[PDB]
Design an enzyme around this catalytic site. Structure first.
Site, PDB file in Angstrom:
ATOM      1  N   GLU A 149      10.196   0.740   2.011  1.00 35.45           N
ATOM      2  CA  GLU A 149       9.872  -0.666   2.104  1.00 35.45           C
ATOM      3  C   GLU A 149      10.485  -1.428   0.930  1.00 35.45           C
ATOM      4  O   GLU A 149      10.951  -2.547   1.094  1.00 35.45           O
ATOM      5  CB  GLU A 149       8.359  -0.873   2.127  1.00 35.45           C
ATOM      6  CG  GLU A 149       7.729  -0.680   3.492  1.00 35.45           C
ATOM      7  CD  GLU A 149       6.241  -0.950   3.470  1.00 35.45           C
ATOM      8  OE1 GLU A 149       5.485  -0.114   2.929  1.00 35.45           O
ATOM      9  OE2 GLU A 149       5.826  -2.009   3.983  1.00 35.45           O
TER      10      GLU A 149
ATOM     11  N   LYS B  71       2.214  -9.802   6.743  1.00 36.47           N
ATOM     12  CA  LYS B  71       3.423  -9.130   7.198  1.00 36.47           C
ATOM     13  C   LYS B  71       3.478  -9.234   8.724  1.00 36.47           C
ATOM     14  O   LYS B  71       2.610  -8.712   9.422  1.00 36.47           O
ATOM     15  CB  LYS B  71       3.404  -7.653   6.798  1.00 36.47           C
ATOM     16  CG  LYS B  71       3.464  -7.392   5.317  1.00 36.47           C
ATOM     17  CD  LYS B  71       3.441  -5.896   5.036  1.00 36.47           C
ATOM     18  CE  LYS B  71       3.745  -5.608   3.581  1.00 36.47           C
ATOM     19  NZ  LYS B  71       3.885  -4.143   3.329  1.00 36.47           N
TER      20      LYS B  71
HETATM   21  N1  LIG Z   1      -5.015  -4.092   2.250  1.00 34.99           N
HETATM   22  C1  LIG Z   1      -3.747  -3.669   2.298  1.00 34.99           C
HETATM   23  N2  LIG Z   1      -3.520  -2.622   3.017  1.00 34.99           N
HETATM   24  C2  LIG Z   1      -2.174  -2.050   3.159  1.00 34.99           C
HETATM   25  N3  LIG Z   1      -1.790  -0.979   3.864  1.00 34.99           N
HETATM   26  C3  LIG Z   1      -0.461  -0.871   3.673  1.00 34.99           C
HETATM   27  N4  LIG Z   1      -0.078  -1.807   2.908  1.00 34.99           N
HETATM   28  C4  LIG Z   1      -1.167  -2.648   2.510  1.00 34.99           C
HETATM   29  C5  LIG Z   1      -1.423  -3.853   1.681  1.00 34.99           C
HETATM   30  O1  LIG Z   1      -0.517  -4.416   1.079  1.00 34.99           O
HETATM   31  N5  LIG Z   1      -2.728  -4.300   1.623  1.00 34.99           N
END
Ligand SMILES: Nc1nc2[nH]cnc2c(=O)[nH]1
Ligand SMILES: Nc1nc2[nH]cnc2c(=O)[nH]1
Ligand SMILES: Nc1nc2[nH]cnc2c(=O)[nH]1
Ligand SMILES: Nc1nc2[nH]cnc2c(=O)[nH]1
Ligand SMILES: Nc1nc2[nH]cnc2c(=O)[nH]1
Ligand SMILES: Nc1nc2[nH]cnc2c(=O)[nH]1
Ligand SMILES: Nc1nc2[nH]cnc2c(=O)[nH]1
Ligand SMILES: Nc1nc2[nH]cnc2c(=O)[nH]1
Lengths: 121, 121, 120, 122, 122, 120, 121, 120
Positions: free
Chosen positions: D21, D99
């Protein structure tokens, strides 16, 4: 309480802080929520018992397409105070004024704007 | 608390102030939020422990597509009163009745409409 | 205060009051707001200080795609109770479960659904 | 109170806990609501009596496009902090960071994200 | 060959056969394709070597918002003929005129319209 | 040459191969392109010199919402044949019939359907 | 006809005749179709047997965000000739450059633009 | 003439030149137009007289989510090649395969992709 809703009003105006924006113009988005009891009209079906959303729309149009101001804050306030002043039965008004296309902003967005709430004062 | 949600219901109808509007007709958009505790039903999975959104849908359809009224207020008022009247389980209803196409408006908008909330009496 | 948001989750399920809906299935729309303080994680930037929204995503998916239930209320209620049970850090869950395609409705609509709020 | 709205800001960034990522990166969506009185500026029509939404936009852009962090929580927190830190007039700020594209998820969604509300505390 | 494109032009007019339509009016959707060599203007970077799409826009806006007609065909015909009459450099023009809101149709649709292609025959 | 366009017609029907689809029904999307000369009408401004798009709309509406058929092919065929049969001036017709919500398909799609071209 | 497709490229630039446009800039939309035989690459899975759509995107980006021109005709013409000049395997190119926000147009539109096709040689 | 249409198919796959793309994966958008006379099936209403678009959908899915390929061209080539081979009735296939999310491009686009036409 009940409310009249005017959503996504699109008008072309000449507001902006950059001198060039005031002579070239651009599109604006306007949401207006007018608080007013609609039950009397809803039971009588008489337009005189409510406030025509067309007159509120027309008022918004005149202002947004009006003389150029620098800020959305000024225009929204104008819309709000003008609405309350012209229609005494309205208890409060929420005005959301936005620019979907902001000059010099290179990337993608929905819009940038203001969101004010005004009660009868 | 909890609520049954009916979003973006589109029905062709003949409501309007103008005479020709009541003749030609047009599309109306309805939003309905029925306040009612859903825990019982969610824990019994029995339809009888809740109000079927189908029934709320048909009641609203019948109204909107019914005898023409002058105002959206009158139409939204009927939907609210009739809904509370037929489904005692419901505690309060919010009705948003709007016209996506307002005759004579030469500029783009999303819609113009009314928004009422009615608690059981 | 703070919350994790899972918006517009689409899962194919087999819930419904009409028998044929249960054997044919359909698409369901899911929105979940999980109430949990996020300041700690916002300052440490370590995973142990928050819950993965991917874990919340998987739990809902499994339920919505799970055994057929007659009502949306039952599914939403399951998501809520299961979420609070699975993550003690969660303080409240708001679940919106809808059907964008309701059988027998012959006119256009966004969706018909439920909206529940459940606190620990 | 009155507020300045920044809706659907789209920025490319490299935040995440997965190394791929941080290598590849992705688009992030952000909504910001800045709580601030606009009455004064509404009366003066002078940009100085308010906070330019352009400035807030550019601070947000800088954060999201900046140094990669593991969690959205952390980036949303930086946005809130720096905003409060840089604009005294603002009383509070709500930041929604999400996202649209979550890796590995095979199904369709709108987005997964965080929603925080911050003010200047002791 | 090349062509100027005018896509999704929205205008409010009073065309239609039904009497109520002539008085109430309604929105009309218009796509216009104007076949015209653009190589020259593309080399001189001079607005005078091409046809300004604003001029084509104005001509169409004037037609659609102008004198009422019973049919979209008539309106589409007028736009095409007037465009060819006004700019001798255009070799052909395709006009798509639609009504997104057709009175008395109870179900939803995108639109019902006409699509004609007219080439310079004079 | 010229053509009448009917775009994105939404009709609720009961067509399909699965027995459950026939019972429950679903929405169908229809596009119709009818090739016919519009010059005469464009100059006369008389609805008599053309084909009312409402007439085409109605024909398709009666068909799709009508008796259940197995295939989209069949329904689309009915629309095309019916249109040509009713309006001889039509030189050709293009019918696009599709299902936005296809039973059992778990992933997202715009739609699956047929697209036929028929002439006399 | 086999082709590489770049659909809906959004780039901020400063083209246009109006002085305010030159100063403020605006968003531009570009669609590019690059005709090339893809059978070899489709069977070899070798990037070398095709043209990278990232290089064509990158080339278009530099042009639209680059040196300002008065007309869309010019910018499109530049993208076309440059693409064909740089990637010899390309047999012909179709460039659709449009302005989604045309200044001083008070009504709504999707966009106004140019559509040009250029073959090798 | 006639053709079966599969529009906007969204599949999760792992194709790409960059190594990280192969481990992470991404969404892919596929349009498929399969040329085949639908006249017979349209008059008989018998599935056997046509090709089920559900099978075409299934094939495409298998290919897009299968072993990673470097280029979109290769995946679209297989989709076409395999469809022509499994369904003798199809005379030609047009495959549009695109990536709505291209890694490292931060300007906003609809998609980048390929568009090929393969005849029997
Ligand atoms: N709460 C939260 N869960 C995730 N799971 C994968 N990435 C993230 C993130 O940035 N925040
Ligand atoms: N807050 C605010 N900021 C701006 N920056 C540029 N124009 C404006 C405006 O109208 N209001
Ligand atoms: N408030 C309101 N105003 C209108 N103006 C025209 N029709 C109406 C209506 O139904 N309600
Ligand atoms: N409230 C409610 N009504 C329905 N009517 C048919 N199915 C349902 C359901 O799941 N919930
Ligand atoms: N073809 C066509 N049919 C109509 N039916 C009602 N009005 C019209 C029109 O303008 N054109
Ligand atoms: N080709 C085709 N395939 C189907 N598979 C299920 N139903 C249908 C249909 O109507 N046509
Ligand atoms: N055809 C064309 N017309 C314009 N009118 C104003 N600018 C332009 C342009 O770039 N091209
Ligand atoms: N044409 C083409 N160009 C690329 N550039 C990076 N990946 C690809 C691909 O798969 N096809």
């Amino acid at each position: 309480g009940d409310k009249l809703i005017l959503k996504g009003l699109k008008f072309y105006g000449f507001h902006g802080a950059i001198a060039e924006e005031r002579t070239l113009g651009q599109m604006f988005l306007v949401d207006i929520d007018a608080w007013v009891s609609l039950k009397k009209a809803g039971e009588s079906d008489n337009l005189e018992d409510t406030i025509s959303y067309v007159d509120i729309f027309s008022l918004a149009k005149e202002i947004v397409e009006g003389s150029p101001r620098n800020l959305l804050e000024t225009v929204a306030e104008l819309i709000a105070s003008k609405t309350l002043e012209k229609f005494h039965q309205i208890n409060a008004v929420r005005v959301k004024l936005s620019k979907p296309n902001v000059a010099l902003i290179k990337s993608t967005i929905d819009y940038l704007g203001v969101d004010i709430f005004r009660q009868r004062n």
